[PDB]
Amino acid sequence: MPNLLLNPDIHGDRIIFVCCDDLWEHDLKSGSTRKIVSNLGVINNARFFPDGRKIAIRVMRGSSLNTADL
Amino acid sequence: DRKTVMVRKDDGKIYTFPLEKPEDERTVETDKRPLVSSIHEEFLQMYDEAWKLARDNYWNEAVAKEISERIYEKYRNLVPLCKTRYDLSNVIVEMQGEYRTSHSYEM
Amino acid sequence: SKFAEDFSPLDGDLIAFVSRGQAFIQDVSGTYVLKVPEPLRIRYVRRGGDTKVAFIHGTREGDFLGIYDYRTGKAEKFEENLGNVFAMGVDRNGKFAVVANDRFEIM
Amino acid sequence: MPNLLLNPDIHGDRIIFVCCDDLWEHDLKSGSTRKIVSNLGVINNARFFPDGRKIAIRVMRGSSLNTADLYFYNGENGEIKRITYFSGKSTGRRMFTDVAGFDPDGNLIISTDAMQPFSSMTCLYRVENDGINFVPLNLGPATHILFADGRRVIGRNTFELPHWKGYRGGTRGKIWIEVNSGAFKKIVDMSTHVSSPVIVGHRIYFITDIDGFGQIYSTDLDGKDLRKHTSFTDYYPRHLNTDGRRILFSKGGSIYIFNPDTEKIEKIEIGDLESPEDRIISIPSKFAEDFSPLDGDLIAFVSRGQAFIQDVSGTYVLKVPEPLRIRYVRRGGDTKVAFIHGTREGDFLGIYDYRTGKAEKFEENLGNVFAMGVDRNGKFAVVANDRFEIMTVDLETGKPTVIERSREAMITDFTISDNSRFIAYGFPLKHGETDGYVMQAIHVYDMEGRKIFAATTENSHDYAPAFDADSKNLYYLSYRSLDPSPDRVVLNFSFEVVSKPFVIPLIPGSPNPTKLVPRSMTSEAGEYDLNDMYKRSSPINVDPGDYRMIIPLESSILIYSVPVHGEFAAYYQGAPEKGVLLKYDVKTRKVTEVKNNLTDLRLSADRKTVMVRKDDGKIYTFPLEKPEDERTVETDKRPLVSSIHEEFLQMYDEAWKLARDNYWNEAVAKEISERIYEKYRNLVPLCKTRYDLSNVIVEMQGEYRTSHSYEMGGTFTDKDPFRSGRIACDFKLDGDHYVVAKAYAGDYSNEGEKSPIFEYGIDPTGYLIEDIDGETVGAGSNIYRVLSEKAGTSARIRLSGKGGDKRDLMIDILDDDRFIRYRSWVEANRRYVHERSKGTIGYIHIPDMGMMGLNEFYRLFINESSYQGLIVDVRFNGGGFVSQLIIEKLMNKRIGYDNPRRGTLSPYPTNSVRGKIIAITNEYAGSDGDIFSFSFKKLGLGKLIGTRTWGGVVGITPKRRLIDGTVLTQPEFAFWFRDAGFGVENYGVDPDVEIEYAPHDYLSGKDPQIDYAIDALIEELRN
Amino acid sequence: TVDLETGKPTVIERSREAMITDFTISDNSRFIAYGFPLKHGETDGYVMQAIHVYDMEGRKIFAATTENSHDYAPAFDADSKNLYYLSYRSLDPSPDRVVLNFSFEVVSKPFVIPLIPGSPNPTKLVPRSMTSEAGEYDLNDMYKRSSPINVDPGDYRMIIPLESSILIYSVPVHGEFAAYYQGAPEKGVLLKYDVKTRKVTEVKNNLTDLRLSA
Amino acid sequence: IRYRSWVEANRRYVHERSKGTIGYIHIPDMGMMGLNEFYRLFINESSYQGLIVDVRFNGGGFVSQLIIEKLMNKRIGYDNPRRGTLSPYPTNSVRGKIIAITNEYAG
Ligand SMILES: N=C(N)NCCC[C@H](NC(=O)C(=O)[C@@H](CC1CCCCC1)NC(=O)OCc1ccccc1)C(=O)N[C@@H](CCC(=O)O)C(=O)N[C@@H](CC1CCCCC1)C(=O)O
Incomplete structure (x- = not known):
């Protein structure tokens, strides 16, 4: 069985998205996917900066995800 | 037998004391044995209930019968793709939105 | 403890309770714990005899009354649909049970 | 900055390895790296299956990584799954329950001791149905299992030994091989340690430092044609692994590849992979220590190198403004506090005022401080160091002044009179240079006159000195009230309750106050005179026992008592000693209990505030006047804030400093330390996790090429133990x-x-x-x-x-x-020996030389000692320090008997072996295990059978921890045998008759060692 | 056993090491438990003691405990369904405060043996509804069913089983000087163990001897 | 008091006359007192070049074997600490030569 992917962002051929609450990156060219950040809590939004280098991330914490920070 | 008393105090713990001698209360412990379950079976269970509640409690009984039966299968097929609680939430909320009405929350 | 509910006192200074859809028969200490042998969603558990306990098993179709004996092991499960049960009790003589549902019925 | 990579495995062009405790994969072709599994805990080993699809993984859990289990990873669907639920026990140097290898059908073969009596018994098992069933290979303990041409290759104790470079003891790595389609032959048994074996073509590649440094070697399937393939000099290579074509390994934090055909080695370029948040949060209680009561009902304490001034509630908390390592904090004034700041150079005294903010920090080096106090008047402080000195540091100038120096141990037990004129303390001493016991006498230093007086004689142990408010008497404790208590099992007696309080009036002619001598009937008013004061000593009428502290008050005495108890939990589990606070009314002479369940106690300056630690581990505080009103000290309200890299640099420097300062051979230390410092310090910044730091520290400890350089404790993960x-x-x-x-x-x-x-x-x-x-x-x-x-x-x-x-x-x-398995095993061997010797030989087994060994030895000694023969089996003996007590019993020669009118004969001595004794030992008996084996031979108690023992005999007694709780050990006590010097170290003991226990011996289900023992004894029992 | 009517004695068993002075009779007068001194070898240095149980019906002796230490102070419960006793088997060394030495000071612990196989150790508090007793008496291989009672080790001289508590005579560790010369009596105390609360308390102190009625 | 004074007196005498090369110990009997007096000095006199084990007037008892056991121990090693003095192995081992004194009052 596959996963549930969501909330993506693009920058050229690179595509970051959320899977299993963690942040992943996929290369349109090579076709390879990898988890770039995890164990931070529940990530629902990731945004590529202009230079496509850094990434602003939103993560939720607390049993019911009542709190969040960047 | 009106002899045993089981209570819950403000500290959240459960206690039990004989009605005759309320001085001798004991603390109920339940975290000795772990709780064992399967994510996918629970998720399927939870989905079906969320879906059943949405239909059984919608203000308009008529519309429910049609709305429920029309969205059930579509969203149930995504449950197995859910590995985390948040995933399941994404599926459940989308199916709640199907009632095109306010106050369909998840807390 | 995190998902526990419906804590209730049984015969022989025993405890029954529900958590995450599962049900258990344990001593206050939580050292001797028995899991009721029944699929997901056991809404309620109620003292029904020296070693017998009645319970409400929930499914997608509705709620049903079930009985279990933590001594012999037997655990029949009726088919008569009761609707959505929200309250359940058993007489002291263990012959019948009183149930309330979302249909506003008492039976 | 880059990361610290390690423990790789290869499969074609794909290379998996460990980084930041997680599992990563790198493609040699594309050059891309990615984390394939995380948040499972600490991963130290990952092994590719044959098809290169699934991956067997070893993960450690529990704060100190005391537990481990195995998981399967499937790169096909990203599926992860736990395979073993053995909860195998593991430590830094014995990371047992791991992957052993793969059989020809592609099945995983693991090595675990989970179902064995001894940890060293890491037996081989074939994993089936993802962990449903385990089929034993009955090949005996093994670390690696390889298959060549349908032949079985076995690696014994072939894991890396970073903590002990140059190891040449009996537990060194060895490789056996199958030949007779069922028989095994030892093929690789060098003088040094052999690790991480692999096979490429028809050669076995492995690592060893036979030449003084770790290099990769290889030989044929006969252990012949030895070849050296590498010439590293920077760091030891480790974790060899292969796919049949190329060999993979790590070194100094980088991964390398070795091509057997080309004999060329190259470094894989991976670059930066992960750099987690450096500023971390910690729970002060977890690393707290040195809790102390201050003025105005305030509390001071130290945690993770930091110090704080807070109210009991922990609501108003002040952090002392001082860099890493604040060993101690002590009340020095209304709002002032003295502290000991530690650095790489040493420890220094510092003062701080939590009201004004000022915080000077003296430069005078005090050495390694282990005790520190301040007078009640806040002018000077008394300090004790590892140089065995006791001194007074001026709180104004900073100038230290040594009072006296012991040549046996530290002077950590002292007190200052309330008028700041006298300093009483326990002074360790010995009558002779080679004396077996260390005595302790109380000394009293007079600030005026600056002369030391003797409070007590030097024939026993006097301690816990304490002055009374008026400063007119000196109270103290001592183990002088000798009275034997009977042993309920063995004929023996010991001094259990021989502790009694004494007092010494500082003014001659003044009587013992607790005596209640009518004032009108005495003529005091004399003047101070500390001469010949040990002659005026007087006991206080309090029943004997085991007292740790005596606190004199107006009309009562507080005494801290510890009820006699077993030492098992304390020796292993580390359980704290349970005490109780007793009160003695001088008038009524009656004794009562003021508080129980105590595990530690501290008294304020004004003798009014009491701070204790109870068995539940919590700290409490109650007024001495009304002990009924105690409050709980909370410190977890405010989080503990620190920086990983600064702590890591701090921890490294300390580990390195302890290793040098505690090495048994002072000479060698100066050279070893200075030579390895820089090399390993440069890897610290590559460490992002606790485990990383551990890898670096352990490798630098191995540089002392000696035994007993361990690392225990510390927090490696927040995962609960398996x-x-x-x-x-x-x-x-x-x-x-x-x-x-x-x-x-x-x-x-x-x-x-x-x-x-x-x-x-x-x-x-x-x-x-x-x-x-x-x-x-x-x-x-x-x-x-x-x-x-x-x-x-x-x-x-x-x-x-x-x-x-x-x-x-x-x-x-x-x-x-485990214990059940163990006892079952012993009773099994017991039955076997009885049956085979036709009831003429007894059997005993000593699991170690600690409390358990004492238990197990006497448990059987009392029933097996009177047979014609006796087998004292010490295989797998983990050591300790009671070997001498055991030898003593076995040494006893039966020379008489007692004839009762009615009953049977009674041998003299009672604890005497009746006949011939034979000792069995293997490569798993060490330390006091080594000592025992050597001694058994030397004293000629009988023949020694088995295989050369471990070879580590340099004792250790840690006395300092790392800010994270880690407990490092340093070989500080070199054992010298007569006519052998330190020879046993790094070698072990050779048994009179060597008897291997080959893989085929396990297949047959026969114990060749115990069998030889039985047979050998039967032959000796013919005369 | 001497017939109180006829006067005829009947020897049950004979030890070859010491006297069999530590015994008790079940309330239903069917069983006789006692400490039996024994030695593995003729020239053995220590004398072990195993509890034996003689059955009036069948007239056969059964082994209550193994013979590797010292088991004593046997005692039956009112219903005559369990046999409680003490033993110095909980080995744990206590450190000598003066000389490098260790000895067994507090290694005494209570044990029980249910006379009906399948019946659990009562002090364990195993829910009746979760057990299936009602079995019949069977003293064979009863030393295998032995079970400890969760009471901290020490130096116990007597164990008295009651309805919902156990009385235990404890003797605190002390010096032997006065006892060896002056002949001073040993100081003990009567402890109570509540089976339910598992809590221990002091019923009486300053004792030097104790006897219980029928 | 008279007894201990006598022992300490002989102790001083032996130290002085042997120029500090011989230790002294005296066993009043072989019971509890003997155990006390023997270890009371053994712990300080055992490490001299020589040792005098005086058993004159020894009234007996039953712990002789325990005493012989200690005197039997042969010193075959030492412990070298980075800081401190040597520690003999075994600990309870006499360092050198031992001589026993006895009279018609030991039985
Ligand atoms: N106090 C404690 N709670 N623990 C201390 C026990 C540590 C121990 N070592 C040994 O038995 C040694 O033989 C010794 C021997 C010597 C040598 C010279 C002087 C004095 C003692 N003893 C020792 O280290 O300790 C005490 C000591 C120290 C200074 C002065 C006087 C006594 C030892 O750990 N041994 C190895 C032996 C391995 C082998 O036999 O090959 C071991 O790894 N054992 C366990 C793991 C443990 C267990 C407990 C502690 C640490 C590590 C194993 O995996 O088998």
Whole structure:
């Protein structure tokens, strides 16, 4: 069985998205996917900066995800 | 037998004391044995209930019968793709939105 | 403890309770714990005899009354649909049970 | 900055390795790296299956990584799954329960001691159905298993030994190989340690430092044609692994590739991979220590190198403004506090004022401080160091002044009179240079006159000195009230309750106040005179016992008492000693209990505030006047804030400094330390996790090329330890039902020595296990996982024996069953020896030389000592320090008997072996294990049978921890044998008759060592 | 056993090491438990003691405990369904405060043996509804069903089983000087163990001897 | 008091006359007192070049074997600490030569 992917962002051929609450990156060219950040809590939004280098991330914490920070 | 008393105090713990001698209360412990379950079976269970509640409690009984039966299968097929609680939430909320009405929350 | 509910006192200074859809028969200490042998969603558990306990098993179709004996092991499960049960009790003589549902019925 | 990579494995162009405790994969072709598995805990080993698809992984859990288990990763669907629920015990140097290798059919073969009596018994098992069933290979303990041309290659103790470079002891790595299609032959047994074996073509590649440094070697399937392939000099290479074509390994934090055909080595370029948040949060209580009461009902304490001034509530907390390592904090004034700041150079005294903010920090080096106090008037402080000195540091100038220096131990037990004129302290001393015991005498230093006076004589142990408010008497304790207490099992006696309080009036002619001598009938008013004061000593009428502290008050005396107890939990589990606060009314002479369940106590300056630690581990504070009103000290309100890299640099420097300052040979230290410091310090910044830092520290400890350089404790993960459900049984998957293959039991009448099932009056052996807690187990349900999930409680278990024998019991699911397995094993060997020797030989086994060894030795000695012969089996003996006590008993020669009118003969001595004794020992007996083996030979008590022992005999007694709680050990006590010097170190003891225990011996199910012992003794029992 | 009517004695068993002075009779007068001194070898240095149980019916002796230490102070419960006793088997060394030495000071612990196989250790508090007793007497291989009672080790001289508590005579560790010369009596105390609360308390102190009625 | 004074007196005498090369110990009997007096000095006199084990007037008892056991121990090693003095192995081992004194009052 596959996963549930969501909330993506693009920058050229690179595509970051959320899977299993963690942040992943996929290369349109090579076709390879990898988890770039995890164990931070529940990530629902990731945004590529202009230079496509850094990434602003939103993560939720607390049993019911009542709190969040960047 | 009106002899045993089981209570819950403000500290959240459960206690039990004989009605005759309320001085001798004991603390109920339940975290000795772990709780064992399967994510996918629970998720399927939870989905079906969320879906059943949405239909059984919608203000308009008529519309429910049609709305429920029309969205059930579509969203149930995504449950197995859910590995985390948040995933399941994404599926459940989308199916709640199907009632095109306010106050369909998840807390 | 995190998902526990419906804590209730049984015969022989025993405890029954529900958590995450599962049900258990344990001593206050939580050292001797028995899991009721029944699929997901056991809404309620109620003292029904020296070693017998009645319970409400929930499914997608509705709620049903079930009985279990933590001594012999037997655990029949009726088919008569009761609707959505929200309250359940058993007489002291263990012959019948009183149930309330979302249909506003008492039976 | 880059990361610290390690423990790789290869499969074609794909290379998996460990980084930041997680598992990563790198493609040689594309050059891309990615984390394939994380948040499982600490991963130290990952092994590619044959098809290169699945991956067997070893992960450690529990704060100190005391537990481990195995997981399967499938790169096809990203599936992760736990395979073992053994909860194998592991330590830094014995990371047992790991992957051993793969059989020809592509099945995983693991190595674990989970179902064995001894940890060293890492037996081989074939994993089946993802962990449903385990089939034993009965090849004996093994670390690696390789297959060449249908032949079985076996690696014994072939894991890396970073902590001990140049190891040449009996437990060194060795490789055996199959030849007779069922027989094995030892083929690689060099003088030094051999590790990480692999096969490429028809050669076995491995690592060893036979030449003074770690290099890769290889030989043919005969251990012949030795070749050296590498010439590294920077760091030791480790973790060899291969795919059949190329060899992979790590070194100095980088991964390299070795091509056997080209003999060329290259470094893989991976670059930066992960750099987690540096600023971290910690729970002050977890690393707290040195809790102390200040003025105005305030509290001071130290945690993780930091110091704080807070109210009991922990609501108003002040952090002392000082860099890393604040060893101690002490009340120095209304709002001032003195502290000991530690650095790489040493420890220094510092003062701080939590009101004004000022915080000067002296430069005068005090050495390594271990005790620190301040006078009540806040002018000077008394300090003790590892140089055995006691001194007074001026709180104004900073200038230290040594009062006296001991040549035996530290002067940490001292006190200052309230008028700041006298300083009393325990002074360790010895009558002779080679004396067996260290005495202690109280000394009193007079600030005026600056002369030291003797408070007590030097014939025993006097301690816990204390002055009274008026400064007119000096009270103290001593173990001088000798009275023997009888041993309930063995003919023996010891001094259990011989502690008694004494007092010494500082003014001659003044009587002992507790004596209640009418004032009108005495003529004091004299003047101070400390001369010949040990002659005026007087006891205080309080029954003997075991007192640790004496506090004189107006009309009563407070005494801290510790009831006699066993030492087992304290020696292993580290359990704290339980004491109680007693009160002695001078008037009524009656004694009462003021507080119990104490494990530590501290008194304020004004003698009014009491701060204690109870058995629950919490700190409390109550006024001495009304002990009924105690409050709980909370410190976890405010988080602990620190920087990983700054702490890591701090921790490294300390580990390095301790290793040098405590090495037994001072000379060698200066050279070794300065030579390895920089090299390993440059890797610290590559460490992002605790485990990383550990890898660096351990490697630098190995640089001392000596035994006993360990690392225990510390926080490596926030993951809870793996759990395992045990009922002392062996399960065998037969068909679709699990059957009870074996039911362990030793002495049925003892405690905790049999499967909990036995209590229901039936032997589970042969029975079938239907279900557990209503859930069915068998071909589909993993019984281990189930059991693991019930560990610590009683679950209903449906059993089925022969016929219609149906059982339904509430069995206790144990968290561990090692001891039961052990006792079962001993009782088994006992029976065997009795039967084979036709009832003429006894058997005893000493698991170690600590409290357990004492237990096990006497447990049987009392019943086996009177046979014609005796086998003292010390195999797997983990050491300790009671070997001399054991030799002493075996040394006793029976020279007489007692003839009773009625009854049987009674031998003299009672603790005398009746006949001939033979000792069995293997490569798993070390330290005091080595000592015992060597001594048994030297004293000629009998013949020594087995295999050369471990070879590590440089004692260790740690006395300092790392800010994270880590407890490092340093070989500080070099054992010197007469006519052998330190020769035993890094070598072990050779048995008179060598008897290997080859892999085929295990296949046959015969113990060649115990058998030789029996037979040999039978022959000696013909005369 | 001497017949109180006829006067005829009947020897049950004979030890070859010491006297069999530590015994008790079940309330239903069917069983006789006692400490039996024994030695593995003729020239053995230590004398072990195993509890034996003689059955008036069948007239056969059964082994209550193994013979590897010292088991004593046997005692039956009112219903005559369990046999409680003490033993110095809980080995744990206590450190000598003066000389490098260790000895067994507090290694005494209580144990029980259910006379009906399958019946669990009562002090364990195993729910009746979760057990299936009602079995019949069977003293064979009873030393295998032995079970400890969760009471901290020490130096116990007597164990008295009651309805919902156990009385235990404890003797605190002390010096032997006065006892060896002056002949001073040993100081003990009567402890109570509540089976339910598992809590221990002091019923009486300053004792030097104790006897219980029928 | 008279007894201990006598022992300490002989102790001083032996130290002085042997120029500090011989230790002294005296066993009043072989019971509890003997155990006390023997270890009371053994711990400080055992490490001299020589040792005098005086057993004159020894009234007996039953712990002789325990005493012989200690005197039997042969010193075959030492412990070298980075800081501190040597520690003999065994600890309870006499360092050198031992001589026993006895009279007609030991039985
Ligand atoms: N106090 C404690 N709670 N623990 C201390 C026990 C540590 C121990 N070592 C040994 O038995 C040594 O033989 C010794 C021997 C010597 C040598 C010279 C002087 C004095 C003692 N003893 C020792 O280290 O300790 C005490 C000591 C120290 C200074 C002065 C006087 C006594 C030892 O750990 N041994 C190895 C032996 C391995 C082998 O036999 O090959 C071991 O790894 N044992 C366990 C793991 C443990 C267990 C407990 C602690 C640490 C590590 C194993 O995996 O088998």
